């Protein structure tokens, strides 16, 4: 009842029932933790990377990754993933 | 995708595979997925983005044909016919195009001009207040508050709780058009379409 | 160009393709460079049947 | 009767008689596991 | 006294056991037959030109 099947520092029951990170440690989620600023996280207790991105569930939830990653990509279910494209600002047509 | 004029966003959210019993990914609904993806906060369970109201009523959802089939079939067995109550599934493409101007008649007013005779202090509208007073409601939009050669849509929700007389909506933007909206005692939406032109034209009157 | 008018068809036969596969390192760390697919094409086609 | 001759975490008798994966562990196959979503696997031991 | 009797990349045990690439022919499992490819080129159409 305190196993870690995927070895991502978050126990199985926490990933199933909800957890949050306090002092770089995954704690069981109480409903009073909200209104303080804490978010409720859930993840796959058999996957170490639930969203399939380079970062494990703990690195995401803990925020223990690149600090330029958006705050919503700390959720083990939202993937840290860039959408890059090109946009035109002036169009120039020539005869030569 | 969330379009939110002046900035666009694109997200990927993990969805459980229902055929695999050993896929222990947490199950999400479309509303929970949207809240997790864009960091939306819920005021009355209504999922504001920053302060722009985001709901199946406050914005317009756009799917591809495969996602709309999976949503239409799951919309039947659901008691709450809310789209945001359908599960998130794999390969499901959603697009949220927030409106340029919007009023719920309760707390959010984004229009640059005003409507004629509101009559809030009600308790209908799917939430909060609504409109009343058969007298004509119109709005003048200076055509400097819109883009030159775009095609727009105008939507809202309308209820006539005694299956009574019709509503008649006319829009003067490029082709002055008129249509006959017959409400129901429940709430529905109309979504009439118009279009601007002329690069600083006359004005826009709905 | 006249065989093209007689109703013949142009075929694009792929004779070989070069590509990689991904191997996770037990923490979700995929790598693809160095994992060439051609190292398994001969071995798979020999113990298999094509359907 | 619980050897692993090829060292692929699945025992010989399971690969010969049938197995499935439950919680990242190879378990012997019961015929009730189907209708739950589980597939029967066999391999070279 | 030799670990590779035939002088090929594979030891006597890897050959006899078949514990090598599965595209190697069955006779090269014999520690005395060498696993060894004979590659050449063969012509299928001959084209002669003046230009
Ligand atoms: Ca875990
Ligand atoms: Ca996990
Ligand atoms: Ca309202
Ligand atoms: Ca084995
Ligand atoms: Ca020897």
Ligand nearest the Cα of residue D7 is 4
Interface of C with A in 10-39 (CB under 8 A): 26-29
Task: Tell me the C-alpha distance between E35 and B197, whole Å.
Answer: 78
Distance A34 CA to ligand 3 centre (A): 28
A75 is in an annotated binding site: no
Q: How many CB atoms lie within 10 A of CB B192?
A: 17
- Using DSSP's 3-state secondary structure scheme, residue A24 falls into coil
Experimental technique behind these coordinates? cryo-EM
Query: What is the experimental resolution, given in Å to one decimal place?
Result: 2.8
Helix (H) or strand (E) holding D32: none
CA distance E5 to B110: 86
Residue pointed to by tokens 């032109």: B197
Using the mean position of ligand 4's atoms as its centre, give its distance from the Cα of residue D43 in Å: 8
C-alpha of residue B146 to centroid of ligand 4, in Å: 69
Q: Answer whether A39's CB lies under 8 Å from A20's CB.
A: yes
For tokens 């009767």, what's the residue?
A: D1
Nearest by Cα to A61 from A22, A6, A5: A22
On whether any CB of chain E is under 8 Å from the CB of C46, the answer is yes
Residue whose token pair is 């002329």: B198
Three-point CA angle A72, A77, A79, nearest 5°: 65
Query: What phi and psi values does residue B13 have, to the nearest 5 degrees?
Result: -125, 135
Q: Give the H/E segment covering residue D12.
A: helix D12-17
CB-based burial, A3-38: b 16+ in 10 Å, e otherwise = eebbebbbbbebbeebbbbeeeebeebeeebeeeee
Nearest alpha carbon to residue C28 among B62, A73, A59: A59
Annotated binding site of E for Ca(2+): 2, 12
- In this complex, the chains that touch C, judged by 3 or more CB pairs closer than 8 A, are A, E
Q: Judge whether C7 is closer than 8 Å to chain A, CB to CB.
A: no
DSSP character string of chain B = -B-TTT--B---B----SS-TT--PPP-BHHHHHHHHHT-B-SSS--BSSSSB-STTTSEEEE-HHHHHHHHHHHHH-SS--GGGSBP-TT--EEEE--SS-B-SSS-B--SS--S------S-SSSS-----SS----EE-SSSS-TT-EEEE--EEB-TT--S-EEEEEBSSS-EEEEE--BSS-EE--EEEE--SSS-S-EE-
Measured between CA atoms, the residue of chain A closest to residue B9 is A83
Cα–Cα distance measured from residue E34 to residue E12, given in angstroms and rounded to the nearest whole number: 10
Query: What is the sign of the dihedral through the CA atoms of B71, B72, B75 and B77?
Result: negative
Q: Is the C-alpha dihedral spanning A35, A36, A39, A45 positive or negative? A: negative
In the three-class reduction of DSSP (H, G, I as helix; E, B as strand; rest coil), residue C30 is classed as strand
What is the rounded distance in angstroms from the CA atom of residue B71 to the CA atom of residue B88?
A: 10
- Residue D6 CB: number of other CB atoms within 10 A? 12
Find the A14 Cα to ligand 2 centroid distance in Å.
10
| Angle, CA of B63, B64 and B66, to the nearest 5° | 115
The burial of C10, by beta-carbon neighbours within 10 Å (0-12 exposed, 13-18 middle, 19 or more buried), is given as exposed
Residue of chain A with shortest Cα separation from B38: A72
Q: Give the HSE-up count for residue E30: Cα atoms under 13 Å, Cβ half-sphere.
A: 5
What CA–CA distances, in Å, run from B151 to A60, B141, B192? Answer: 42, 15, 11
| Contact (Cβ atoms closer than 8 angstroms) between residue A4 and residue A12 | yes
Can you tell me the distance from the alpha carbon of C16 to that of D9, in angstroms, rounded to the nearest whole number?
A: 35
Going by the DSSP 8-state scheme, the letter that residue C20 receives in this structure is: B
Spatial separation of the C-alpha atoms in residues B68 and B44, rounded to whole Å: 27
- Residue E46 half-sphere exposure toward CB, CA atoms < 13 A: 2
N- to C-terminal Cα distance for chain D?
13
Map tokens 């975490």 to a residue. Answer: D9
* Cα dihedral sign, D38-A45-C28-A68: positive
Closest CB to A83: pick one of B10, B23, B39: B10
Query: Using CA atoms, how far apart are residues A44 and E16, in angstroms rounded to an integer?
Result: 45
Q: Would you call D22 and B22 a contact, using CB atoms and an 8 Å cutoff? A: yes
Q: How far apart are CA B102 and CA B115, in angstroms?
A: 12
> Which ligand is nearest the CA of B124, by number?
3
Distance from CA of D23 to the nearest CA of A (A): 7
Question: Rounded to the nearest whole angstrom, what is the distance from the C-alpha of residue B134 to the centroid of ligand 3?
Answer: 18
Report the first-to-last Cα separation within chain E, whole angstroms: 62
Report the alpha-carbon distance of residue C41 to residue C39 in Å, rounded: 6
Identify whether the C-beta of residue B123 lies closer than 8 Å to the C-beta of residue B129. Answer: yes
H-assigned helices in chain E: 12-17
CB B154 within 8 A of CB B192: yes
Q: Nearest residue on chain D to A47, judged by CA atoms?
A: D24
**Do residues B100 and B54 touch, judged by C-beta distance below 8 A?**
no
Alpha-helix runs per DSSP H in C1-51: 2-5, 38-46
Residue E30 CA to residue C25 CA, distance in Å, equals 37
Reading the block at residue C45, the tokens are 């086609």
Task: Please list, in sequence order, all residues whose beta carbon lies within 8 angstroms of the beta carbon of residue A48, skipping any fewer than 6 positions away.
Answer: A6, A7, A8, A56, A57, C26, C27, C28
Among chain C residues, the shortest Cα distance to E20 is held by: C43
Alpha-carbon distances, residue B187 vs B74, B129, B163 (angstroms)? 21, 13, 11
């Amino acid at each position: 009842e305190d196993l870690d099947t995927d070895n991502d520092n978050i126990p199985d029951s926490y990933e199933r029932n909800g957890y949050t990170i306090k002092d770089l440690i995954a704690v069981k989620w109480e409903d009073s933790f909200a209104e303080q600023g804490y978010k409720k996280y859930v993840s796959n207790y058999l996957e170490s990377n639930t969203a399939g991105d380079p970062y494990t569930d703990y690195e995401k939830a803990s925020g223990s990754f690149d600090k330029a990653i958006k705050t919503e990509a700390r959720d083990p279910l939202v993937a840290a993933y860039p959408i890059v494209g090109v946009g035109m600002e002036k169009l120039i047509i020539s005869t030569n | 995708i969330l379009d939110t004029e002046n900035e666009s966003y694109e997200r990927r959210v993990t969805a459980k595979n229902l055929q695999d019993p050993e896929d222990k990914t947490p199950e999400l609904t479309i509303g929970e997925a949207i809240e997790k993806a864009f960091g939306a906060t819920k005021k009355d369970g209504l999922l504001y983005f920053n302060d722009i109201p985001i709901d199946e009523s406050c914005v317009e959802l756009i799917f591809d044909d495969n996602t709309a089939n999976k949503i239409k079939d799951s919309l039947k067995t659901l008691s709450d016919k809310k789209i945001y109550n359908v599960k998130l599934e794999r390969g499901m493409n959603i697009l949220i195009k927030t409106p340029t101007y919007f009023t719920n008649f309760d707390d959010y007013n984004n229009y640059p001009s005003t409507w004629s005779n509101v009559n809030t202090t009600n308790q209908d509208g799917l939430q909060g207040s609504a409109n009343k007073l058969n007298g004509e409601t119109k709005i003048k939009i200076p055509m400097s508050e819109l883009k030159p050669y775009k095609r727009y849509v105008f939507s809202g929700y309308s209820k006539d709780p005694l299956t009574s007389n019709s509503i008649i909506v006319k829009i003067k933007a490029k082709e002055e058009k008129t249509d006959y909206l017959v409400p129901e005692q429940g709430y529905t939406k109309f979504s009439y379409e118009f279009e601007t032109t002329e690069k600083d034209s006359s004005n826009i009157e709905i | 160009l006249k065989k093209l008018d007689a109703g013949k068809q142009i075929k694009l036969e792929t004779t070989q393709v070069s590509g990689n596969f991904g191997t996770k390192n037990s923490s979700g760390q995929i790598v693809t460079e160095g994992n060439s697919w051609s190292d398994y094409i001969s071995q798979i086609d020999s113990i298999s049947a094509s359907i």
